[PDB]
Amino acid sequence: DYDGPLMKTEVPGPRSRELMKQLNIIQNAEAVHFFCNYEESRGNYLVDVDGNRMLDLYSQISSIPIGYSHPALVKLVQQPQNVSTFINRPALGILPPENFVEKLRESLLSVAPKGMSQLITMACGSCSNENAFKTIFMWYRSKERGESAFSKEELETCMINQAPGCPDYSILSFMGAFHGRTMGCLATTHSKAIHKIDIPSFDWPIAPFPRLKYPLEEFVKENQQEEARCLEEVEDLIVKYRKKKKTVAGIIVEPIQSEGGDNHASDDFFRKLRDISRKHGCAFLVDEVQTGGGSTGKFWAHEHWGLDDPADVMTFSKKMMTGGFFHKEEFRPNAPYRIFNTWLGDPSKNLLLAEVINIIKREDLLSNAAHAGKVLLTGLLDLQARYPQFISRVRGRGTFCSFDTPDESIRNKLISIARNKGVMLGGCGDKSIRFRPTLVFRDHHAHLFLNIFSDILADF
Amino acid sequence: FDYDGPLMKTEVPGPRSRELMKQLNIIQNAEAVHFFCNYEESRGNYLVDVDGNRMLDLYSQISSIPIGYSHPALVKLVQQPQNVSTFINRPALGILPPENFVEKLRESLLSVAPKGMSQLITMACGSCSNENAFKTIFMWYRSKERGESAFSKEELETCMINQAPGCPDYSILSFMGAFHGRTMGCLATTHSKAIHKIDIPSFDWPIAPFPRLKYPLEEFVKENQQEEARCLEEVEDLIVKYRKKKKTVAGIIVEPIQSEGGDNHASDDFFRKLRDISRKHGCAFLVDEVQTGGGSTGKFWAHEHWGLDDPADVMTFSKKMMTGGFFHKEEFRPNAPYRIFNTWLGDPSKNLLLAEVINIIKREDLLSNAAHAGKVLLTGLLDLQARYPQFISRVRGRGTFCSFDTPDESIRNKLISIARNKGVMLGGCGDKSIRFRPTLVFRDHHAHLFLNIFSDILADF
Ligand code: FES
Numbered sequence: 001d002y003d004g005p006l007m008k009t010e011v012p013g014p015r016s017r018e019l020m021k022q023l024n025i026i027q028n029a030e031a032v033h034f035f036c037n038y039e040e041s042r043g044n045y046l047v048d049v050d051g052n053r054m055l056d057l058y059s060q061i062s063s064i065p066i067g068y069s070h071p072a073l074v075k076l077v078q079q080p081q082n083v084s085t086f087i088n089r090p091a092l093g094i095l096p097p098e099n100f101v102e103k104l105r106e107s108l109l110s111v112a113p114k115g116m117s118q119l120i121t122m123a124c125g126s127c128s129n130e131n132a133f134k135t136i137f138m139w140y141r142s143k144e145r146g147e148s149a150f151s152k153e154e155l156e157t158c159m160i161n162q163a164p165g166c167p168d169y170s171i172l173s174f175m176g177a178f179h180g181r182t183m184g185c186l187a188t189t190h191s192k193a194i195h196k197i198d199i200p201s202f203d204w205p206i207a208p209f210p211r212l213k214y215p216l217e218e219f220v221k222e223n224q225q226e227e228a229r230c231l232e233e234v235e236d237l238i239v240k241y242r243k244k245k246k247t248v249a250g251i252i253v254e255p256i257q258s259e260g261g262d263n264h265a266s267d268d269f270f271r272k273l274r275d276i277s278r279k280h281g282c283a284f285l286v287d288e289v290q291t292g293g294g295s296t297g298k299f300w301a302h303e304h305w306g307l308d309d310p311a312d313v314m315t316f317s318k319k320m321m322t323g324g325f326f327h328k329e330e331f332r333p334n335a336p337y338r339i340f341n342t343w344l345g346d347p348s349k350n351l352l353l354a355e356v357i358n359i360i361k362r363e364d365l366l367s368n369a370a371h372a373g374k375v376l377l378t379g380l381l382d383l384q385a386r387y388p389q390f391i392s393r394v395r396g397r398g399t400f401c402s403f404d405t406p407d408e409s410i411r412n413k414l415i416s417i418a419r420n421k422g423v424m425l426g427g428c429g430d431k432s433i434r435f436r437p438t439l440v441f442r443d444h445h446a447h448l449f450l451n452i453f454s455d456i457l458a459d460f
Numbered sequence: 461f462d463y464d465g466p467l468m469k470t471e472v473p474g475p476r477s478r479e480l481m482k483q484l485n486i487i488q489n490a491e492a493v494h495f496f497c498n499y500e501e502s503r504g505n506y507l508v509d510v511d512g513n514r515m516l517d518l519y520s521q522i523s524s525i526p527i528g529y530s531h532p533a534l535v536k537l538v539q540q541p542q543n544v545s546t547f548i549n550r551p552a553l554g555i556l557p558p559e560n561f562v563e564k565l566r567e568s569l570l571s572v573a574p575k576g577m578s579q580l581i582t583m584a585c586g587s588c589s590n591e592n593a594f595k596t597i598f599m600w601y602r603s604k605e606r607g608e609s610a611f612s613k614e615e616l617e618t619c620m621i622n623q624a625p626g627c628p629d630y631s632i633l634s635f636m637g638a639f640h641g642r643t644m645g646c647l648a649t650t651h652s653k654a655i656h657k658i659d660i661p662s663f664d665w666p667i668a669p670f671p672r673l674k675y676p677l678e679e680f681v682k683e684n685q686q687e688e689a690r691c692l693e694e695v696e697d698l699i700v701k702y703r704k705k706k707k708t709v710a711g712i713i714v715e716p717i718q719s720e721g722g723d724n725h726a727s728d729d730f731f732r733k734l735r736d737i738s739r740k741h742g743c744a745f746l747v748d749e750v751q752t753g754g755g756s757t758g759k760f761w762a763h764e765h766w767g768l769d770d771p772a773d774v775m776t777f778s779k780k781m782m783t784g785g786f787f788h789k790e791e792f793r794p795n796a797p798y799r800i801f802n803t804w805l806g807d808p809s810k811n812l813l814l815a816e817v818i819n820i821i822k823r824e825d826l827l828s829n830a831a832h833a834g835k836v837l838l839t840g841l842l843d844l845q846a847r848y849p850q851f852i853s854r855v856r857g858r859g860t861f862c863s864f865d866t867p868d869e870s871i872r873n874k875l876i877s878i879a880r881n882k883g884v885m886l887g888g889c890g891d892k893s894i895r896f897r898p899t900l901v902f903r904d905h906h907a908h909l910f911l912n913i914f915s916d917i918l919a920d921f
Contacts, residue, residue: 022562026570026580031797036556038549039542049559060552061803073548077538081500086547087534087813088499089782091521093492097499098510101483109487119487123584126802130643134660141659155654159636161662165654169661175620181802182591183645193616193626194798198602199595200630201622202661318803321550336492337655341587341642342522342779348809352548 001043001067001440004448005422006053013050033419041068043440046424054419055448058426062258062290062436063318065356066365070440072355085348092121092344100347107354108324111299115309118332121324121345125289125317126180131339132313132325133184133250136283137169138338139331140249143281169249170202170241172234172282174209176260179252179287188252191259205237205248209257210265214393227269231276238280250283250313251276255301258290261429262402264395267305274307283331286311293319294360294439297370297398304397319439321356322349365439373398375443376435379450387457390414399441402434417456423449461532461901463506465909466883467514474511494880502529504901507885515880516909519887523719523751523897524779526817527826531901533816546809553582553805561808567815572760574787576770582785582806586750586778587641592800593774593786594632594645594711597744599799600792601630601710604742630710631663631702633695633743635670637721637890640713640748649713652720666698666709670718671726675854688730692737699741711744711774712737716762719751722890723863725856728766735768744773744792754780755821755900757859758831765858780900782817783810826900834859836904837896840911848918851875860902863895875917882913 012020012034023029040047044067046056056068066073076082090097108119120135122128151164158165173179173188180186181195187202189195210227213219238248253273257263277284291301293316302310312331317323322345333339360366377396380403384391393404405411411431418425428434437445473481473495484490501508505528507517517529527534537543551558569580581596583589606612612625619626634640634649641647642656648663650656671688674680699709714734718724738745752762754777763771773792778784783806794800821827838857841864845852851871855864866872872892879886889895898906 019557019559019562023557026562026565026578028794028797028800031554031801032557033555035559035561036551038551038558039545041545041549046556060550060556063550063552063803068549069545070548074544077544077547083535083538084500084502084530086538086809087531088502088529089521089524090497090499091524094494095497095507095521096480096484096493098480098496100496101480101487104487117487124588124802124804127585127587127643133644134642137661138659150654150658154658158654158657158659158662159651160667161648161657161664165658166660166662181595182588182643183594184643187622190620192798193611193619194796196619196622197611197615197626197799198599198619199627200598200663201619201627203622206621333489335655336489337653338658339489340492341585342524343585348547 002045002053005045005055007420007422008052009050011048011050011052011054011419013048013052015049019049038068043067044438044445052422054422054424055445056424057435057437057441057449058424059436059438061318061426062295064438065293065319065321066359067438067440070359072359073352076351076355082351085351089343089346089348091342092347093340097347103347103350103354107350107357108320110357113300113302113310113314113326114307115328116314116326117329118327119324120339121322121350123343123345124323125315126182126185127341128289128315128317128323128325129179129188129252129287130182130184132285132315133171135313135325135327135331135333135339136171136250136285137167138333139283140169140247141167142334168246170204170246172205172207172237172248172251174207174253174257176209176257176263177252177254178257178259203246205241207234207237209260209263210269212264214395223266227265231269231272234273235276235280238282248280248282250285252285252287254287255291255304256296256397256400258434259428261432262395262434264397270302270305271307274305274310283312285313285315287315289315289317289323291400292316294366295369295373295399295436297366297373299366301397321353322346360439368442369398369439372437372441372443372446373401375446376449377401379446383450383454383457390457390460396435399435399437402428402432405431405433407431414456414460418453421452421456423452461504461528463503463514466506466516468881468883469513470511472509472511472513472880474509474513476510480510499529504528505899505906515883515885516906517885518896518898518902518910519885520897520899522779522887523756525899526754526780526782527820528899528901531820533820534813537812537816543812546812550804550807550809552803553808554801558808564808564811564815568811568818569781569785569814571818574761574763574771574775575768576789577775577787578790579788579793580785581800582783582811584804584806585784586776587643587646588802589750589776589778589784589786590640590649590713590748591643591645593746593776596774596786596788596792596794596800597632597711597746598628598630599794600744601708602628603795629707631665631707633666633668633698633709633712635668635714635718637670637718637724638713638715639718639720664707666702668695668698670721670724671730673725675856684727688727692730692733695734696737696741699743709741709743711746713746713748715748716752717757717858717861719895720889722893723856723861723895725858731763731766732768735770735772746774746776747772748776750776750778750784752861753777755827756830756834756897757861758827758834760827762858782814783807821900829903830859830900833898833902833904833907834862837907837910838862840907844911844915844918851918851921857896860896860898863889863893866892866894868892875921878917878921879914882917884910884913
């Protein structure tokens with residue numbers, strides 16, 4: 001792709017600021033950071049409307065899998081036979097296209113997690129998780145009622161939002177979690193107050209997620225004890241909510257908590273959590289919406305746990321272009337029209353995804369993520385050694401890396417400075433800086449960032 | 461743009477469809493699948509399946525295809541080299557919009573904004589449209605109550621752990637028979653069929669009766685007036701009841717025509733009065749036009765029939781509009797960013813297509829066409845109703861948004877099955893209703909193609 005970044009103005013520049021003013025008329029546009037020229041963007045480089053070309057290590061909140069304007073995807077749109085897929089969107093649940101199954105074989109089914117033979121598609125991460133919740137609730141009621149018909153009382157009360165038709169079951173989630181913002185998802189989200197405030201919720205159990213101490217090899221015992229404490233509280237919560245007649249039907253967790261501030265835990269913790277879930281008859285729901293797609297060095301991050309039975313349900317979106325969830329055969333809905341909506345994804349996204357997965361495989365991009373990520377993490381550890389007054393808790397897996405700054409203002413200042421220097425970084429939590437490079441992020445991009453950021457720290 | 465009429469080769473689903481349905485059933489419950497389709501050969505009003513059957517489609521992918529299959533104007537868009545990026549570079553629209561984002565909105569959604577609603581946020585589907593409409597309404601209501609006070613310390617603390625006062629116990633009032641989506645917030649306001657709701661945790665929110673009109677309308681003028689008045693009273697009683705329960709109604713959601721519940725209509729007067737009740741109790745009035753929106757009732761938005769300068773506070777849309785989202789009044793604008801947000805907030809490629817759809821709707825006078833084609837369709841249905849009272853009752857509609865009842869679910873399903881094999885795709889709704897959702901290039905001559913086919917079916921039934 002491009003050789004390096006190229007800056008012409010401060011960001012946002014005059015043209016971005018004019019467009020931001022226009023947009024702010026019709027909606028709150030305070031979140032916009034600048035306007036983009038995607039036609040001129042290529043690979044790891046994002047071009048804005050003021051002609052600035054920045055190395056993008058945020059990749060549209062970790063949703064761009066193989067870079068901007070990838071030539072393989074360009075070729076797809078150029079093919080006359082693919083026109084119909086872009087302009088004839090089906091109600092997939094009732095009238096799928098002829099190639100629906102074969103395109104699924106070329107894409108999502110070719111990367112199915114272990115033990116999960118079932119797949120339903122969805123259009124985003126939020127309806128992926130919402131429908132995973134519903135799939136779990138249905139499965140749990142199925143266990144309880146066995147091979148029996150719905151009762152007349154259930155059929156009548158569910159229509160008016162009452163038990164027993166509408167059970168008071170719960171999903172257990174973790175502090176620091178982010179699972180989406182529709183009202184079901186939002187109940188399991190515990191990232192920032194501004195995400196949650198003034199919105200009605202569910203009285204569902206909330207467990208602590210381990211806060212590891214760094215550097216890791218100095219706090220081995222403390223961290224295992226921290227993880228042990230959290231696992232105990234999960235089990236206590238499950239028991240407590242069963243007593244409250246609010247049975248925990250499932251547990252949802254991210255393999256790495258993203259929006260909450262890139263919180264990591266050992267593979268051992270997740271294996272033990274998986275066991276706790278099974279032990280109490282809770283469905284284990286793993287949210288790979290952000291970790292999925294290969295940046296951790298394996299296609300799904302949970303693959304690092306080395307389990308033949310990693311989970312019951314697994315959701316995905318972002319890098320996968322389409323959303324959806326894999327699940328075990330036993331979680332298959334017993335009747336149609338229970339897990340359903342108009343579009344259930346989009347065949348055009350499946351078309352693109354199939355080519356993305358082909359590229360990832362052909363070009364060995366999973367291995368590349370591991371390699372480039374190590375270069376990045378090693379460099380971050382060096383800068384942490386050299387600038388302890390600015391950098392701490394350097395952590396990561398693959399390119400999925402992050403570190404903390406002393407406070408929020410410094411975090412924001414560093415991001416602002418880096419952006420004007422031609423590097424786009426993301427923030428998470430109060431004072432963390434995170435990396436979500438696309439999968440065509442290579443060694444030399446890592447070296448480029450490190451050398452730019454090193455100069456930034458020296459001048460800071 | 462065109463085929464002559466339907467052309468059938470096999471029963472539906474045919475052998476190739478049944479084979480593909482068998483394959484799909486391995487990886488997921490595929491019992492809902494009607495058949496597999498050849499969209500490449502589908503054109504205008506006609507859906508072609510994998511067995512070569514060509515059917516007149518009066519269901520239009522659950523009322524979501526706006527100007528028919530493989531429209532040449534949309535073909536042209538995908539063919540243009542300058543549009544490639546829009547299809548393969550999907551932005552996080554909330555933070556990094558494309559250069560043409562505002563202008564393409566001016567060409568599309570903003571050019572059909574409802575009266576009194578200066579604000580617009582885009583969403584990817586009807587469910588997240590309604591969910592975020594709810595949230596916008598909750599934040600607005602809380603903002604009313606705390607005035608200029610900042611977020612209290614207790615609110616900021618409790619909201620992180622799903623507790624009041626940070627998470628208020630406010631409610632959205634909805635109607636029996638309603639359908640607003642299936643995510644857990646939406647679902648609480650949905651009251652369509654049991655199979656949609658059963659075994660899913662819900663919210664204790666007020667549920668009002670939706671008027672059940674009696675037909676023919678001109679023979680039940682007094683009764684229908686009284687029915688609507690009854691429902692309006694019960695709406696108001698519920699708001700008061702739930703205020704005392706400390707589960708304050710922050711908003712009221714309603715469809716201008718109930719779809720999935722069984723194509724239930726109500727007078728323009730009813731909705732005007734409901735709007736007034738909403739305002740009176742300080743509830744936001746949220747109109748769900750996900751299915752009624754996009755022109756099939758003869759006006760772009762169905763609520764336009766009401767004739768109000770202030771028709772609602774918030775209005776959601778999707779399906780025919782290609783993208784979802786919601787218009788709303790300025791006073792409902794979120795005070796801070798990242799409260800109404802998600803990764804994609806729609807998709808610029810859908811906005812690209814929608815701008816051209818809206819261009820076609822205006823240039824080909826398709827709003828007026830829907831009113832005309834719909835009148836022809838309805839007149840024919842009323843004739844079949846007079847000729848076959850053993851099978852057809854309560855013929856009703858506005859524009860092409862038409863429907864009628866059959867004696868029972870068994871007969872309803874049989875008629876749909878026979879019609880499909882005779883080259884016409886129909887939809888069902890409610891217990892025993894048959895509904896029509898033709899695309900906007902449905903013409904009076906397509907109405908007659910259907911009517912003549914269905915007339916022969918009824919004669920042999
Ligand atoms: S909720 Fe996922 S696209 Fe609307």
